[PDB]
Structure 1
């Protein structure tokens, strides 16, 4: 249950570079850059559900740690990959050559995505519920 909760974006680095390199329509890129998105996570042991809401875009995912899962990414593209826990508080995966690291520290989730030289970091904070 460690990750469960509702969290909202505080700040982020390199949103616009990252999002162009992954092929997000620039129209979504401009609408999306200053949105403070909400993520909802339900962890139950190894099973995760997470919903990411950014404006009108709602992206809902689920995965079992250690198993092949299908992840809907930024673009709508669904990619087969594995998510691993590296200790209770860290989720790690690689899709489309992006390394995603999600780390919970108390009430703060830091998410770092790297595609080559591009490091897209996001910092989110718990918001009751």
Structure 2
């Protein structure tokens, strides 16, 4: 069950991922420690998100099994389709990054794997 407004608790490889993809140290030092809200509304295939990237609210919707355009940090807007296992594990192919989102009861983890860099968020359902 994915529906909820999930507040951020722990954020792992933020400094190593944002410098590896080409972002500024001034904006990285602002968004690294802010405990913001990460929303998801589960409508069968269409998952409507409202995500806090430090100060910016990035709101887009992903379709499980058909093409869906989402905003990236380095780039523009990526058509990344998401596959679902057991109503808790969401897997996609972003801008050369394997993104794995897992729901453990009422706590969600977003693990963005870029080769050796493992960018892991840990947010609780509210």
Is the TM value for this pair above 0.5? yes
Q: Deviations over 1:13-70 (max 9, x none)?
A: 1110101112222221010111112101101111110010234201011021011111
TM-score (norm. length: structure 2): 0.92
Which blocks of at least 5 consecutive residues in structure 2 are unaligned? none
Residue 39 of structure 2 aligns with which residue?
A: 40
Q: How many residues align?
A: 126
Work out whether residues 31 and 55 of structure 2, in 8 Å CA contact, stay in contact via their aligned partners in 1.
no
Counterpart-to-counterpart distance in 1, 2:114 and 2:43: 30
Distance 1:95 1:55, change over 3 A: closer
Task: State the superposition RMSD in angstroms.
Answer: 1.4
CA distance, structure 1, for counterparts of residue 26 and residue 61 of structure 2:
27
Question: Of Structure 1 and Structure 2, which has the larger fraction of its residues in strand?
Answer: 1
Superposition misfits of 4+ residues, deviation over 3 angstroms: none
Alignment of 1:15 with 2:14, yes or no, is yes
- Say which is worse superposed, 66-75 or 107-116, in terms of deviation: 66-75
